């Protein structure tokens, strides 16, 4: 290129010649000279100049603004509230279009994260992924998707294409594991069991409307059909298609990963999986 | 400069070179052990966790002992562990 041809002519690039990009380095102001010398940008002598100004939010005597306002519980229990990261249908479709999220396999949290489709911070009170209505139209893909929360419209959107959506609860200790499995594998601990929802979320997951993982599968077909009526689409038969087996697969309530049963240990270095044999342990993990 | 070993270790470290080194093993082990006395002046928390009535969140608890002073007269008798608070 032309720039490289200019370099042919110029003397060698060496440790002498290097200069910063103009504007990057602004020189510092020192309280020397005549301009910045006397009083050095501090004003005339007072509380200000001696550097003993009162703390921030002190109004010189009168009841400060922040204090005089009444207290109200805008943030009363902020740390205990659960947060769901939103995944749009647009986002999901675009991930499938670029081959980042694989439709020939089921989608869960772990697949999405690995796809860089989402960022989840368990520590920051994130409790997984919420599936949002946005971009319901121009969503044309048939997938088995797993999300903690979904809106009825987004359920409808997925089931119109012939996909299957279900909601499954993840406890914080399960979530950090599922999002980043490789670090957990290096912790040397055996896989724990996914805990059941708290009392207030039991009614949610034991409901066919939300497509809960603890909802009665006998209550599923009529629910699917009711949603099909309301949004006026012909509800397709899933059993007919080739990929039916894949759309069937659902991890059980106490399972975090697809093949890996709780209480197993993964030895990464020699690519082995160690099982317990002990009756006590087996009883404990199978509960 | 820095001392090689933290200063708090010196008591332990000195037991290893002198007359204390050639003391019997069982005595040194009895000296080392650091088990807590039974509560005398404080009602302990029953459980490892407890629910906060404030926020309704289950929180860990610890048992923190009151420091007890024993005057030298206590050595000449049998106080059940009661000292001056």
């Amino acid at each position: 290129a032309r720039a490289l041809d200019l370099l042919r002519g110029l003397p060698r690039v060496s440790l002498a010649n290097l200069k910063p990009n103009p504007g990057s380095k602004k020189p510092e102001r020192r309280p020397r000279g005549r301009r910045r010398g006397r009083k050095c940008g501090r004003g005339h002598k007072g509380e200000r100049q001696r550097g003993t100004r009162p703390r921030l939010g002190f109004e010189g005597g009168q009841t400060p603004f922040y204090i005089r306002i009444p207290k109200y519980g805008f943030n009363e229990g902020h740390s205990f509230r659960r947060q769901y990261k939103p995944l749009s249908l647009n986002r999901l479709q675009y991930l499938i279009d670029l081959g980042r999220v694989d439709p020939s396999q089921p989608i869960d949290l772990t697949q999405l994260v690995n796809g860089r489709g989402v960022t989840i911070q368990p520590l920051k009170r994130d409790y997984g992924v919420q599936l949002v209505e946005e971009g319901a139209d121009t969503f044309t893909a048939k997938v088995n998707i797993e999300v903690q929360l979904a809106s009825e419209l987004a359920i409808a959107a997925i089931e119109k294409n012939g996909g299957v959506v279900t909601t499954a609860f993840y406890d914080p200790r399960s979530l950090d594991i599922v999002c980043k499995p490789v670090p957990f594998f290096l912790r040397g601990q055996p896989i724990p069991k996914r805990m059941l929802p708290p009392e207030e979320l039991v009614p949610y997951y034991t409901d066919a409307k939300n497509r809960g993982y603890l909802a009665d599968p006998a209550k599923f077909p009529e629910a699917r059909l009711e949603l099909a009526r309301k949004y006026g689409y012909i509800l397709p038969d899933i059993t007919k298609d080739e990929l039916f087996k894949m759309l069937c697969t659902r991890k059980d309530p106490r399972q975090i990963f697809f093949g890996l049963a709780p209480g197993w240990v993964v030895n990464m270095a020699d690519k082995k999986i160690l099982k317990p044999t002990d009756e006590n342990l087996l009883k404990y993990y199978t509960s | 400069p820095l001392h090689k070993y933290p200063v708090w270790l010196w008591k332990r470290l000195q037991l290893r070179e002198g007359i204390c080194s050639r003391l019997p093993g069982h005595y040194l082990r009895s000296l080392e052990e650091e088990r807590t006395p039974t509560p005398v002046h404080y009602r302990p928390h029953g459980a490892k966790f407890k629910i906060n009535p404030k926020n309704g969140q289950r929180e860990r608890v610890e048992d923190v002992p009151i420091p007890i002073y024993f005057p030298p007269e206590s050595q000449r008798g049998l106080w059940g562990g009661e000292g001056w608070i």
Partner: protein, 250 residues
């Protein structure tokens, strides 16, 4: 048998590969033994002189720890009492004899303790740094590609007189792929030569390349450099440190 080399890693459609002459250290007149194609993204990117400066400055400063300290007024010995009463004498009023004003006093604002100047430029920036430095070397006829760093003899005067014959210049940086599998002959020669320096591939940096007038590379090392620097773009953001296992990294 001519020594030909092509680029293994895929090139962009609009870009075309650059060529370099291939020579060997075996003979004085053993230039032009082969031809090589180099990946244009590593070896023919935009000359970004600001980047060289950035990387170079980080390289010089990030390791630096300052050892200078001075005692403040509080840390100087003595100086407890008030030297004389305020009011009484004609003297100027003082609170301690160890104040900054006094001779033998503590320092007002001095070097304070061991100081670290550690910071990290982003990875992609350091990577780009290496790229620029390599383009710049080839643009200015300061870069040479070799089949192997194999010498007819370990006599260190042979290496100096060859550089003189080939107009390399006063200082030459020799890069090999691995430390263990460096030839005997080059190690012997370079051990007792000040201006000529032998490093493994992983050693290579912006500072040395700028310091030395010539950069000499082997064909093993050129494929290696291409791999790693080209890996830097066309990768995702990390989920966790790359030292950990991935499905396709090492």
């Amino acid at each position: 048998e001519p020594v030909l080399r092509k680029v293994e890693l895929p090139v962009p459609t609009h870009r075309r590969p650059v060529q370099a002459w291939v020579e060997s250290l075996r003979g004085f007149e053993q230039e032009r033994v082969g031809l090589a194609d180099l990946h244009p993204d590593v070896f023919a990117t935009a000359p970004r002189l600001d980047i060289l400066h950035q990387v170079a400055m980080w390289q010089k400063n990030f390791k630096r720890i300052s050892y200078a300290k001075t005692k403040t007024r509080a840390e100087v010995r003595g100086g407890g009492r008030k030297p004389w009463p305020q009011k009484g004498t004609g003297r100027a009023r003082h609170g301690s004899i160890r104040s900054p004003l006094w001779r033998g006093g503590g320092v007002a604002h001095g070097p304070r303790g061991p100081t670290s100047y550690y910071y990290m430029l982003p990875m992609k920036v350091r990577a780009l740094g290496l790229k620029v430095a390599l383009t710049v070397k080839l643009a200015q006829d300061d870069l040479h590609i070799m089949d192997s760093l194999e010498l007819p003899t370990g006599d260190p005067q042979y290496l100096t007189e060859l550089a003189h014959y080939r107009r390399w210049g006063d200082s030459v940086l020799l890069v090999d792929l691995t430390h263990e599998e460096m030839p005997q002959s080059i190690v012997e020669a370079t051990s007792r030569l000040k201006t000529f320096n032998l490093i493994p591939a992983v050693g290579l940096n912006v500072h040395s390349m700028l310091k030395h007038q010539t950069l000499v590379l082997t064909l093993p090392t050129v494929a290696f450099l291409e791999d790693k620097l080209l890996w830097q773009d066309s990768r995702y953001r990390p989920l966790y440190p790359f030292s950990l296992p991935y499905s396709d990294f090492p």
